[model samples]
Target: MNPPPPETSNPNKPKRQTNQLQYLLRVVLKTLWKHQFAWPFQQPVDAVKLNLPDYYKIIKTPMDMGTIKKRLENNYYWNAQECIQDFNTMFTNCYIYNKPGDDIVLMAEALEKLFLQKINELPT
Candidate 1:
């Protein structure tokens, strides 16, 4: 049998940029949460600026388990343990939550697949 010719690369293909996926993911999450929670204030207000490091720390620190637990209970009235477990699942199993199955094993597998996909898509 004759060998096929090697495939040629296309320069017009979009160049993948570092952190592009991460930036896109962040934008998606920000938009989703912004609408869902009325975040960043629904109305205009005086701006209070902080340094980049301080800003990141302030925003990121709220992701701590304690804060998450408190917010879940205070805002959503969820059981602390249930909320924590759900949060953990959401973070760890995006697929299953995206389309959860009735069977626990299938749900877990779906979530595992989603978590791995996200991790794989992340930039090094």
Candidate 2:
């Protein structure tokens, strides 16, 4: 039998290989930013300028691709699940603000589909 488990008790070592995960995740973000439907979501909604005064009242946790990018660069995500959650939150806010058949809503749907597809390509 192996001698215990090499006591890799180094405190500096991560419990999991998150460094690689973050790198791959960044690639996914870059691809999404390049997507045609990404413009509407590239930045946070300007409720005041857009004349959407009720937006914040309805969406409790608004999120956007730009905010996600900032958070990702800061290593705020600990796992793929959290990243996916933020993406969904962004889409959900879009859905809440726009009509189901609105162009922006459609964009959110398409972008979310692509986001999911990209995430699936990541290592499990």
Candidate 3:
């Protein structure tokens, strides 16, 4: 049976399920931020400093942890799936821009694995 809706709660408060999803997303993001390999992904790629002239051409829609975190805090994500997709996008960009055996590529793979493992612990 479905539970009855709240009749007198604050209108500004989100639904219980929505709040829970955001909380879970925040927790997962914190875990990722604390990760050792997270430093490289904390901000948008500095193509100029890194000396990759064509980086922007190859990765037009660059994703990064700092952007994702800010978006999450701003309620930009309607669901956990969307947040996860951003994480994937960040990792995929690394895979595409870096060479097969590059250190950054390896770090991306490692961070992605950790992200997936943490995501799996969320309630369905």
- Report the Cα RMSD per candidate: 21.3, 12.1, 11.0
**Each candidate's TM vs. the true structure?**
0.22, 0.79, 0.79
| lDDT by residue for model 2 (22-117), tens | 754567889889999999787777777677778777876878888777766656666767667888889998988788889899888988888778
Per-residue lDDT over 1-124 for candidate 3, one digit per residue giving the tens place of the 0 to 100 score: 1122212233464523365357555688888899898999988777776777788778766888887777666666667776678888899999988888799988888888988788776764
- Decoy 1 TM-score against native: 0.22
Q: Give me the runs in candidate 3 sitting further than 4 Å from their true place.
A: 1-20
- Sorted by lDDT, highest first, which candidate order results? 3, 2, 1
Clashing pairs in 1: none
Question: In model 2, which runs have C-alpha deviations exceeding 4 angstroms?
Answer: 1-25
User: Per-residue CA lDDT of candidate 1, range 38-88, in tens?
Assistant: 322222111233122332322321222233323332343223333334335
Which pairs clash (backbone N, Cα, C closer than 3 Å) in model 2? none
Best by TM-score: 3
lDDT values, one for every candidate: 0.33, 0.72, 0.74
